[PDB]
RNA sequence: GUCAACCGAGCGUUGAUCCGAGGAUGUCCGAAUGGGGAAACCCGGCACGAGUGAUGUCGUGUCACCAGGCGCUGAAUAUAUAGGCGUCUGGGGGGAACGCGGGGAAGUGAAACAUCUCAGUACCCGUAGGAAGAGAAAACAAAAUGUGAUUCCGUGAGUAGUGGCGAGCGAAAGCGGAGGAUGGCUAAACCGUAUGCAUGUGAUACCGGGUAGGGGUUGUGUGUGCGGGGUUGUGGGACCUAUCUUUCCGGCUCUACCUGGCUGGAGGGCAGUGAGAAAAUGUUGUGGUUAGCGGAAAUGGCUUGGGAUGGCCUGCCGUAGACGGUGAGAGCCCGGUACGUGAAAACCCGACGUCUGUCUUGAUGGUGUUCCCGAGUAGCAGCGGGCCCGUGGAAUCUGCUGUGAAUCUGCCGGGACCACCCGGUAAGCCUGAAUACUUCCCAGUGACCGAUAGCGGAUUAGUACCGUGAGGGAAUGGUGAAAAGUACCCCG
RNA sequence: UGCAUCCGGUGAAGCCGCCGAGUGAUCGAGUGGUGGAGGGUGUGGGAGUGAGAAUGCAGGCAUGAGUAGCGAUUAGGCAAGUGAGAACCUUGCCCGCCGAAAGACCAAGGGUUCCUGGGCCAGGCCAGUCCGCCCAGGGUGAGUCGGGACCUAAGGCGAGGCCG
RNA sequence: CAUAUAUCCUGAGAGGUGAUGCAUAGCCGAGUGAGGCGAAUUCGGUGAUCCUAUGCUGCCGAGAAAAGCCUCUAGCGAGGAC
């Protein structure tokens, strides 16, 4: 995928099941979405690819904080 | 017949004088060599070397 | 430094029956550098000999391919240039036939 | 230079040929990078310069892409932004193995086979380094008064165990060892700060009490960036508050005055290119590497033989009888060895003095309570990976979703779980040495081969030849001591 | 190969032998020819340790065999020629074949095969003085030809970009 | 205002020049092959799958783009146009 942006919750690769096994993965994706937000600092609307988890992070942490944390990682937002 | 310390007395424009002269000599030698009017083949080598020395001295004087 | 000399392009004459039949009527064939061209050769010649060129030509030659105990070698290509001096008509002395 | 001669013409004691280190030049393709392109070939721009009666032409440079920093502008559109223009630094690809993270098979074995195994191997990806990764206890252990970062080797152990309890897989603790740095740096409570989004007791508050001008060191909030303080487990730390209180002063604690606390310089100490901040400096060691050089002693005698280095008989050297070659096995012929020498320049080690900081304005202990001890995390549930462990009673370690806590009578572990005791203090970060490996280079060894062998390649060898293409892929060593390679004649 | 001793350019090995031996694998320190530098013996050590067969591999040579064929359905001939050598090579006169091709010109493709001089141990399905064979030398000239510097289709690459 | 063989455009070809030249039948001796002079050069037929023709007519299956050429302005504009 375009890859998460605030955390880095990438995929994973499972395998087997019950009822006798069979070996066979099925990526365990993450739940990213395309929520947008508003930066009152620079007067702008930003769209991101963020999981619901990361939305939780935002609403109990801020957006400025998050973009600074992403600036660190230098994601091409 | 020259050497580097001998040439390093000469300023630039003198070096270019000798440079152009030696190229004229090399040209006339190549025509003589084709025609068969040449025996002392080695003058080609000597001239080629002298041209190299002169360019070398110029570059020394431009990187000094 | 670098100094454009015209005498580094023109490499050598040509010596053969065709060339001499041309010289009998004032056409001279030289061997040049492959990356030359006609304006460059014209300028080189009507500088070197201070004589009045009016038309120039060219040609390319793909070198021969000889054999050896080793195997299949190959000589070098060239570029032959052919000059028709105008009515000025001072023949090129340094040629030496 | 050479296979590889021949011919011609030359140079060299004024030091050539040759060897070593540094420089210069360095056409075109190639990450290829001005644009383009069927790889090595076609077309241009801009500044300068050369050149023509002017154009054409020529030469020297430079012009791609992105990421970041800085600078100018801020389109729809108001803030203002994306974007646009200029400049500065990076990255871009190749590599023989070795490493770490991720993905990830199958033939095979099971005398069938799907679970399992082959193997988390081959292969693929992303990134490295000269080594990597891991690494300082939220660990082991068992009541022994024990151990004390990690890694790699030996054993434990083919054991306890796991497993269609079938094939088969398979530890760890512990113990002995190599190497030792039982290593350091941060965040938070708390202050001093610039701030930045807010407001206005618009005042009895901003500070050391107090003598007080103001009338706000903005009055109070709140995150941000900087600086102090603080780095622990038997808990520590910040507030508090006594005690001894291991330098001089400059100014500061809003302010003149008594103290407490800062902001400066100075002797000093400590340390340094360290992991613990970082650059260059100049001395500098017969310290090391990159060419080399000297180097002992028999024309010894008779015979054989084409040639003595052989046999026999006479001498010698030996810090040198290793090796090879020389017309037949050579310590005394040659090359060289044992041994000692040798570097203008460059490179590497430390050594220093520069230079840089850094503690110095300080510490040891006391004493009763509030505050802090790394949050979308740890934990629990649902699917899954891997751990001896195939969902089983199945801990610890973990991946995605969903839910979601406290700060020391706190929390995590000691193979479900609960109570007691024990050990330890997660969710921030760096860390050398032991270890693995050889494209290349240097010097040697061989109960290894000796031309159908040995690297596929002693011979033009990844060549010829085959294939459209990826890709396959051969064969051929020996004259003799030295070419003295049969001059000359006869048949043809 | 460790160790001890013996022979060796006054001729080892290897090969061809002759004469002989051993119960056998085999042996000759028993002698001749060739040839030109290492070998033997006893004791131990270690093995890429013994080939007649794998529709076995590599090289060389036989039988078939001096046999089949010698590449179309156009067809060759006589004189002279140089030449060591002529059914074929050069010339002369005949003859015959194709004649919407078996003729003249381009593109792709190949790459000196083109001309001259010399040459014939290899090659040409015979021979060869000949040849697209061998060696050396020579030879391809564009303001207007076919392309580029002029443009675009199918399609490709693809700044930014979007997805993964 | 217009229907005119007006006017314009395009356009095979016949004609003149291009061409007093070239070149050609042939002749001369000449022998490798060099050479040199070089006559007439009118008239009819026949007939292209070629040219006008990207034309014309008809039909349906309804038939590349861009550069180039001409043109109108934006603009560079006092010097130059033929």
PDB file of C-alpha atoms in Angstrom, chain B:
ATOM      1  CA  UNK B   1      66.826  19.238 -28.761  1.00  0.00           C
ATOM      2  CA  UNK B   2      65.504  20.766 -25.530  1.00  0.00           C
ATOM      3  CA  UNK B   3      64.876  19.893 -21.886  1.00  0.00           C
ATOM      4  CA  UNK B   4      62.371  21.017 -19.236  1.00  0.00           C
ATOM      5  CA  UNK B   5      64.665  23.264 -17.212  1.00  0.00           C
ATOM      6  CA  UNK B   6      65.807  24.819 -20.478  1.00  0.00           C
ATOM      7  CA  UNK B   7      62.203  25.431 -21.492  1.00  0.00           C
ATOM      8  CA  UNK B   8      61.125  26.772 -18.092  1.00  0.00           C
ATOM      9  CA  UNK B   9      63.274  29.801 -18.823  1.00  0.00           C
ATOM     10  CA  UNK B  10      61.002  30.539 -21.770  1.00  0.00           C
ATOM     11  CA  UNK B  11      57.830  32.500 -21.173  1.00  0.00           C
ATOM     12  CA  UNK B  12      54.456  31.432 -22.554  1.00  0.00           C
ATOM     13  CA  UNK B  13      54.396  33.091 -25.972  1.00  0.00           C
ATOM     14  CA  UNK B  14      57.831  31.673 -26.729  1.00  0.00           C
ATOM     15  CA  UNK B  15      56.529  28.221 -25.848  1.00  0.00           C
ATOM     16  CA  UNK B  16      53.611  28.654 -28.204  1.00  0.00           C
ATOM     17  CA  UNK B  17      56.018  29.793 -30.914  1.00  0.00           C
ATOM     18  CA  UNK B  18      57.989  26.574 -30.577  1.00  0.00           C
ATOM     19  CA  UNK B  19      54.757  24.591 -30.280  1.00  0.00           C
ATOM     20  CA  UNK B  20      53.333  25.782 -33.577  1.00  0.00           C
ATOM     21  CA  UNK B  21      56.737  25.347 -35.223  1.00  0.00           C
ATOM     22  CA  UNK B  22      56.987  21.752 -34.055  1.00  0.00           C
ATOM     23  CA  UNK B  23      53.515  20.938 -35.287  1.00  0.00           C
ATOM     24  CA  UNK B  24      54.463  22.316 -38.700  1.00  0.00           C
ATOM     25  CA  UNK B  25      57.494  20.054 -38.603  1.00  0.00           C
ATOM     26  CA  UNK B  26      55.401  17.032 -37.730  1.00  0.00           C
ATOM     27  CA  UNK B  27      53.032  17.767 -40.597  1.00  0.00           C
ATOM     28  CA  UNK B  28      55.826  18.136 -43.131  1.00  0.00           C
ATOM     29  CA  UNK B  29      57.309  14.918 -41.808  1.00  0.00           C
ATOM     30  CA  UNK B  30      54.106  12.977 -42.306  1.00  0.00           C
ATOM     31  CA  UNK B  31      53.987  14.106 -45.920  1.00  0.00           C
ATOM     32  CA  UNK B  32      57.644  13.184 -46.356  1.00  0.00           C
ATOM     33  CA  UNK B  33      56.977   9.780 -44.822  1.00  0.00           C
ATOM     34  CA  UNK B  34      54.139   9.068 -47.218  1.00  0.00           C
ATOM     35  CA  UNK B  35      56.108  10.291 -50.225  1.00  0.00           C
ATOM     36  CA  UNK B  36      59.092   8.194 -49.132  1.00  0.00           C
ATOM     37  CA  UNK B  37      61.293  11.288 -48.900  1.00  0.00           C
ATOM     38  CA  UNK B  38      62.124  10.449 -45.258  1.00  0.00           C
ATOM     39  CA  UNK B  39      64.739   8.259 -43.605  1.00  0.00           C
ATOM     40  CA  UNK B  40      65.171   9.449 -40.018  1.00  0.00           C
ATOM     41  CA  UNK B  41      61.849   8.127 -38.836  1.00  0.00           C
ATOM     42  CA  UNK B  42      62.581   8.833 -35.182  1.00  0.00           C
ATOM     43  CA  UNK B  43      62.151  12.586 -35.580  1.00  0.00           C
ATOM     44  CA  UNK B  44      58.436  11.847 -35.424  1.00  0.00           C
ATOM     45  CA  UNK B  45      58.857  10.437 -31.924  1.00  0.00           C
ATOM     46  CA  UNK B  46      61.097  13.269 -30.829  1.00  0.00           C
ATOM     47  CA  UNK B  47      58.711  15.954 -32.006  1.00  0.00           C
ATOM     48  CA  UNK B  48      55.719  14.215 -30.482  1.00  0.00           C
ATOM     49  CA  UNK B  49      57.543  14.127 -27.148  1.00  0.00           C
ATOM     50  CA  UNK B  50      58.517  17.790 -27.324  1.00  0.00           C
ATOM     51  CA  UNK B  51      54.909  18.779 -27.899  1.00  0.00           C
ATOM     52  CA  UNK B  52      53.959  16.777 -24.842  1.00  0.00           C
ATOM     53  CA  UNK B  53      56.603  18.543 -22.773  1.00  0.00           C
ATOM     54  CA  UNK B  54      55.342  21.924 -23.850  1.00  0.00           C
ATOM     55  CA  UNK B  55      51.711  21.242 -23.011  1.00  0.00           C
ATOM     56  CA  UNK B  56      52.917  19.804 -19.726  1.00  0.00           C
ATOM     57  CA  UNK B  57      54.819  22.940 -18.832  1.00  0.00           C
ATOM     58  CA  UNK B  58      51.813  25.075 -19.701  1.00  0.00           C
ATOM     59  CA  UNK B  59      49.625  23.035 -17.398  1.00  0.00           C
ATOM     60  CA  UNK B  60      52.200  23.296 -14.624  1.00  0.00           C
ATOM     61  CA  UNK B  61      52.140  27.056 -15.033  1.00  0.00           C
ATOM     62  CA  UNK B  62      48.321  27.023 -15.001  1.00  0.00           C
ATOM     63  CA  UNK B  63      47.998  24.885 -11.853  1.00  0.00           C
ATOM     64  CA  UNK B  64      50.872  26.459  -9.927  1.00  0.00           C
TER      65      UNK B  64
END
